[PDB]
């Protein structure tokens, strides 16, 4: 249950952490601010992304990713592969040769921001797009609305 798991000290760049501990600043009271910004078209910043204790360079609220462009929607199908979930967005293509439709899909991998507790199998997830994060990962998780739950035995 620790944050320093990598071999280098993972830290937000902008907040300045080494500031003037003298005997006026007593060591029985320890606190730091946690950097977060707000993007733009009306999304909340969820609770555990502000007072949370994690760290990321690629979370859209507390990393250097400035997310802009399209906003798309999907269904979670595969939640392996650390900090990265695979969502299978699924559409209905139209062919005018038969005047009838055709089921098609191509799944897509998005960056799981670590401020979320339950992101399970089969969840409707809204997702915006940003700069390229990896070779497959471009997009980014914003907000999980309820699915596969609200009541689990």
């Amino acid at each position: 249950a620790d944050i320093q798991t990598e071999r280098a000290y993972q830290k937000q760049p902008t907040i300045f952490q080494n500031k003037k501990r003298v005997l006026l600043g007593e060591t029985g009271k320890e606190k730091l601010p946690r950097y977060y910004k707000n993007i733009g078209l009306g999304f909340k910043t969820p609770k555990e992304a502000i007072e949370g204790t994690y760290i990321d360079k690629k979370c859209p609220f507390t990393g250097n990713v400035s997310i802009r462009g399209r906003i798309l929607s999907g269904v979670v199908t595969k939640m392996k592969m650390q900090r990265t979930i695979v969502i299978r967005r699924d559409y209905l293509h139209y062919i005018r040769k038969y005047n009838r439709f055709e089921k098609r899909h191509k799944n897509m991998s998005v960056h799981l921001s670590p401020c979320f507790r339950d992101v399970q199998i089969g969840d409707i997830v809204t997702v915006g797009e940003c700069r390229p994060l990896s070779k497959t990962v471009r997009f980014n998780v914003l907000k999980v609305t309820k699915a596969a739950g609200t009541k689990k035995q």
Binding site: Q4, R7, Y9, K11, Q17, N18, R21
Partner: peptide
Amino acid sequence: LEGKELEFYLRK
């Protein structure tokens, strides 16, 4: 280096 971070890198 200073602070809790100096406690980190000297430990590694």
